[PDB]
């Protein structure tokens, strides 16, 4: 039940930004390289209503909601809550898009590794009802009183899925572009009142972003987000789609993606119909790559892979054959390779270029479908 620390040189900080306070403003968790490395560790799932959301998502009873709370409610992630940003450089920025039933905090294994290598990571929380739960404030007085308003996962009928999944991944793309704009506006001084009263001052992020070096990363629905997002906003220079779920994308986007794009898949999630859509994005004029992590399952990319033991994990499909640490290191080192290659990072990550090709015992070049 331990999320792995950042393997890179930088001490990693973490905080939450919401702005504006509304249903229509941006909500994200930042993972950044931190000055001091001796703040408290960050509360992994920091409100009760998330556990209730996960129950509604998993399809448990009113009960397991508080079970999950009992077992996980006090779990931390190895990021220095509200630590000062490490000054003296413009860091590359990743926007990260959670999967269905996820929310902003469940991809901390990946955020903390990227920050420990020099990235700022904004992990958005979508308000398309794709999250188990999210929240916002109704009006200023509410945000002033801390009066949270909770939006829970929407379950769909067979007859809705096509249409509403598409409207949701568009809203997800919009949300990734809005988070990018909020962060770039903060980088250039626009004053912002965080709707969460937190010990991190947001004036710290002034001239902290390398505004030419931006990538969108996302698991599952998050992989569809990446693809849709890249389609709509070229500020995103390349995309990494972790185990994309391609159902939400209209046929129109496969034409419409200039930026390099890297499919990192688990062995046991993928299927013909889905793989056939990934292939649609390929073209001789554009850089697409695809590796499959051997032994991996869909959930090997999110942090619940790390929240139980061997036998319980494989029981609930949060763990596969491969070790969880091996799989996120491979995912993460191939990620850092693709980011250096296509953002132009002045770093040592090209040592892992062989992973982008799937030359490792635990990688399959392309797909097993």
Curated annotation (Swiss-Prot):
Result of changing residue 243 to A: Loss of activity
Annotated effect of mutating residue 243 to N: Loss of activity
Keywords: Asthma, Disease variant, Glycoprotein, HDL, Hydrolase, LDL, Lipid degradation, Lipid metabolism, Phospholipid degradation, Phospholipid metabolism, Secreted, Signal
Chief place of localization: secreted
Effect of residue 220 to A: Loss of activity
GO biological process: lipid oxidation; low-density lipoprotein particle remodeling; peptide hormone processing; phosphatidylcholine catabolic process; plasma lipoprotein particle oxidation; platelet activating factor catabolic process; platelet activating factor metabolic process; positive regulation of inflammatory response
Catalyzed reaction equations: a 1-O-alkyl-2-acetyl-sn-glycero-3-phosphocholine + H2O = a 1-O-alkyl-sn-glycero-3-phosphocholine + acetate + H(+); 1-O-decyl-2-acetyl-sn-glycero-3-phosphocholine + H2O = 1-O-decyl-sn-glycero-3-phosphocholine + acetate + H(+); 1-O-dodecyl-2-acetyl-sn-glycero-3-phosphocholine + H2O = 1-O-dodecyl-sn-glycero-3-phosphocholine + acetate + H(+); 1-O-tetradecyl-2-acetyl-sn-glycero-3-phosphocholine + H2O = 1-O-tetradecyl-sn-glycero-3-phosphocholine + acetate + H(+)
Any one GO cellular component localisation term in the record: high-density lipoprotein particle
Keyword Transport: no
Subcellular location: Secreted, Extracellular space
Transmembrane residue ranges: none
Induction: Up-regulated upon monocyte differentiation toward macrophage lineage.
Consequence of changing residue 317 to T: Reduces the association with HDL particles
The enzyme's E.C. designation: 3.1.1.47
Entry PTM: N-glycosylated. Macrophage-derived PLA2G7 carries sialylated complex-type N-glycans that hinder its binding to HDL particles.
GO molecular function, one term: 1-alkyl-2-acetylglycerophosphocholine esterase activity
Enzyme class label: hydrolase
Active site feature: 220, 243, 298
Disease: Platelet-activating factor acetylhydrolase deficiency: An enzymatic deficiency that results in exacerbated bodily response to inflammatory agents. It can be associated with several disease states including inflammatory gastrointestinal disorders, asthma and atopy. Asthmatic individuals with PAFAD may manifest aggravated respiratory symptoms.
Purpose: Lipoprotein-associated calcium-independent phospholipase A2 involved in phospholipid catabolism during inflammatory and oxidative stress response. At the lipid-aqueous interface, hydrolyzes the ester bond of fatty acyl group attached at sn-2 position of phospholipids (phospholipase A2 activity). Specifically targets phospholipids with a short-chain fatty acyl group at sn-2 position. Can hydrolyze phospholipids with long fatty acyl chains, only if they carry oxidized functional groups.
Family: Belongs to the AB hydrolase superfamily. Lipase family.
The name this protein goes by in its record: Platelet-activating factor acetylhydrolase
Protein's organism: Homo sapiens (Human)
Covered residues, full protein: 54 to 422 of 441
């Amino acid at each position: 039940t331990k999320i792995p620390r950042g393997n890179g040189p930088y001490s990693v900080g973490c905080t939450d930004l919401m702005f504006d306070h509304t249903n229509k403003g941006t909500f994200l968790r930042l993972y950044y390289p931190s000055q001091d490395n001796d703040r408290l560790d960050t509360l992994w799932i920091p409100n009760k209503e998330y556990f209730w959301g996960l129950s509604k998502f998993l399809g448990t009873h009113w009960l397991m909601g508080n079970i999950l709370r009992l077992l996980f409610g006090s779990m931390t992630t190895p990021a220095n809550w509200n630590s000062p940003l490490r000054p003296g450089e413009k860091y590359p920025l990743v926007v990260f898009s959670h999967g269905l039933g996820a929310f902003r905090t469940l991809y901390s294994a990946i955020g903390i590794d990227l920050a420990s290598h020099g990235f700022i990571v904004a992990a958005v929380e979508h308000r398309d009802r794709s999250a188990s739960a999210t929240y916002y404030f109704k009006d200023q007085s509410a945000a002033e009183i801390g009066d949270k308003s909770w939006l829970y996962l929407r379950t769909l009928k067979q007859e809705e899925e096509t249409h509403i999944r598409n409207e949701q991944v568009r809203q997800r793309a919009k949300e990734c572009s809005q988070a990018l704009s909020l962060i770039l506006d903060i980088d250039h001084g626009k004053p912002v009142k965080n709707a969460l009263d937190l010990k991190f001052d947001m004036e710290q992020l002034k001239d902290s972003i390398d505004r030419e070096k931006i990538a969108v990363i996302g698991h599952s629905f998050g992989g569809a987000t990446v693809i849709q997002t890249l389609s709509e906003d070229q500020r995103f220079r390349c995309g990494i789609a972790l185990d994309a779920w391609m159902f939400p994308l209209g046929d129109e986007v496969y034409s419409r993606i200039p930026q390099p794009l890297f499919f990192i898949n688990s062995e046991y999630f993928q299927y013909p119909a889905n793989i056939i859509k990934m292939k649609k994005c390929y073209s001789p004029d554009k850089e697409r790559k695809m590796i499959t992590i051997r032994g991996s399952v869909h959930q090997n990319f999110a942090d619940f892979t790390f929240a139980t033991g061997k036998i319980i994990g494989h029981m609930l499909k949060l763990k596969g054959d491969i070790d969880s640490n091996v799989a996120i290191d491979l995912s993460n080192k191939a990620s850092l390779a693709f980011l250096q290659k296509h953002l132009g990072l002045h770093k040592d990550f090209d040592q892992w270029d062989c992973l982008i090709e799937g030359d490792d015992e635990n990688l399959i070049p392309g797909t097993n479908i």
